[PDB]
Write a protein that binds this ligand. Structure first.
Ligand SMILES: COc1nccnc1CC(C)C
Ligand SMILES: COc1nccnc1CC(C)C
Length: 132
């Protein structure tokens, strides 16, 4: 549900400010986060992939190679209002996109691709939120 996905994204984003400092990241990234769930919007900045990976890691959802920890990702979904069935769905999508996205040494870019694949799957389900 959109409503859930809205709360997830707001909460995934909360620690952005800490990552900064910790990464040297710019304001191109805030424009990418602000626009993320916009239909057809396309993330072009490498450094936004870096920021997602830093956020996910800080939430214990990511191993040091960029892959999803499925258990921890379920725990994060459930903490923010996803029931079981929605959470496991979110998980099957990230995992599916992990498998489909070309492998890449550049974790930041690979993370872009996964996050793009994910966003597209979520619009398809009619779950992408309107983030004011
Ligand atoms: C795990 O990452 C997430 N999980 C659920 C919802 N939103 C995101 C992130 C965004 C949009 C930055
Ligand atoms: C956990 O969220 C994530 N984990 C790894 C890479 N990308 C994201 C964003 C998604 C899944 C949209």
């Amino acid at each position: 549900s959109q409503e859930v996905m809205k709360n997830l994204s707001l909460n995934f984003g909360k620690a952005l400010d800490e990552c900064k400092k910790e990464m040297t990241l710019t304001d191109a990234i805030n424009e990418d986060f602000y626009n993320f769930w916009k239909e057809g919007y396309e993330i072009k900045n490498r450094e936004t992939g870096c920021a997602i990976m830093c956020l996910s890691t800080k939430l214990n959802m990511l191993d040091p190679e960029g892959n999803l920890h499925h258990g921890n990702a379920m725990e994060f979904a459930k903490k923010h209002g996803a029931d079981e069935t929605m959470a496991q769905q979110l998980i099957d999508i990230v995992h599916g996109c992990e498998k489909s996205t070309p492998a890449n040494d550049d974790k930041c870019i690979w993370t872009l691709g996964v996050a793009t694949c994910f966003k597209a799957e979520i619009h398809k389900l009619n779950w992408a939120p309107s983030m004011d």
